[PDB]
């Protein structure tokens, strides 16, 4: 029963581990979300501007 309890404790550990691992995936994913958005915004401003620059 203590080994059953040992399974239970490792289970709660792994459950909160799954919480935080989903969180790590989400942290990189939202880091990626902001990267594509802001990097896209920067390259787009830069691109239409350089278009404007050389064509001007």
């Amino acid at each position: 029963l203590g080994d059953f309890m040992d399974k239970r404790d490792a289970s709660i550990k792994e459950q909160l581990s799954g919480v935080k691992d989903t969180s790590s995936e989400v942290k990189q994913l939202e880091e990626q979300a902001n990267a594509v958005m802001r990097a896209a915004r920067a390259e787009i401003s830069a691109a239409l501007n350089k278009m404007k620059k050389e064509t001007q």
Partner: peptide, 28 residues
């Protein structure tokens, strides 16, 4: 005697209450 009656009552209260908090932690 019934010292142990009232005592087993409140003491298993504290004991199983603490273990109730332990399994409650396993849940929460």
């Amino acid at each position: 005697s019934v010292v142990l009656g009232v005592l087993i009552f409140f003491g298993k209260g504290v004991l199983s209450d603490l273990l109730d908090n332990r399994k409650q932690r396993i849940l929460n």
